């Protein structure tokens, strides 16, 4: 079965600029600016359209040593983003797949708002547990405020 899960947050920056930098090139971003939230990026296969595999590893001493992404759907236009955890960590006898949904939209003050959407596909009926999905969305906002952050700072990158 799928237990669904849906948030929201804001950002400072424009939405077309935080998807080509946050979502984009989260491959040399994360290892960059949040070396302490992740610890490498590697392209297991494809180019970053869908299909793409790639494998996080996380630092030393975190609950888990890694997962492996699959790149679902790109859409440049809407700046939606889709892609499935397909290995490692949380995934295996009790979990078979992590399916998210990303969309960033403008905002007229000139910053953005995220959209996730998280499906968790259980194989026999395991529960998800709260501090599973609140330690992701933890890691996720971690990841986009050290972005966020690299951004304002740095003018001339992701124009
Ligand atoms: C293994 C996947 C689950 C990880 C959960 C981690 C949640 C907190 C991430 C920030 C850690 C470091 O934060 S930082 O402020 O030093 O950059
Ligand atoms: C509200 C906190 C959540 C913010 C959203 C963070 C989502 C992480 C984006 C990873 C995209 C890159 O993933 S990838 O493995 O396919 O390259």
Same mark, same amino acid.
């Given at each position: 079965?799928?237990?669904? #899960? %849906?948030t %929201?947050?804001?950002? &400072?920056?424009?939405?077309?600029? @935080?998807?080509? +930098?946050?979502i @984009? ?5 994360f290892? /960059? ?10 392209? =297991?296969?494809?180019? $970053? ?10 630092? *030393? $001493?975190?609950?888990?040593?890694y997962?492996?992404?699959? &790149?679902? *759907?790109v859409?440049?236009?809407?700046? /939606? #983003? ?8 949380? =995934?295996?006898?009790? @979990? %078979? ?18 959209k =996730?959407?998280?499906k ?6 395991? %529960? ?8 992701? /969305?933890?890691? $996720?906002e971690? !990841? !986009?405020? +050290?972005?966020?952050?690299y @951004? !304002? +700072?740095?003018?001339?990158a #992701?124009?």
């Amino acid at each position: 079965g799928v237990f669904n #899960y %849906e948030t %929201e947050t804001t950002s &400072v920056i424009p939405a077309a600029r @935080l998807f080509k +930098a946050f979502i @984009l090139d989260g491959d040399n971003l994360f290892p /960059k600016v949040a070396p302490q939230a992740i610890s490498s990026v590697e392209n =297991i296969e494809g180019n $970053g359209g869908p299909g793409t595999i790639k494998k996080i590893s996380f630092p *030393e $001493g975190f609950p888990f040593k890694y997962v492996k992404d699959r &790149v679902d *759907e790109v859409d440049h236009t809407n700046f /939606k #983003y889709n892609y499935s955890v397909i290995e490692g960590g949380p =995934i295996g006898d009790t @979990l %078979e797949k992590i399916s998210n949904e990303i969309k960033i939209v403008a905002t007229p003050d000139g910053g953005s708002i995220l959209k =996730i959407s998280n499906k968790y596909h259980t194989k026999g009926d395991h %529960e998800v547990k709260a501090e599973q999905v609140k330690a992701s /969305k933890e890691m $996720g906002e971690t !990841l !986009l405020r +050290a972005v966020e952050s690299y @951004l !304002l +700072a740095h003018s001339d990158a #992701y124009n």
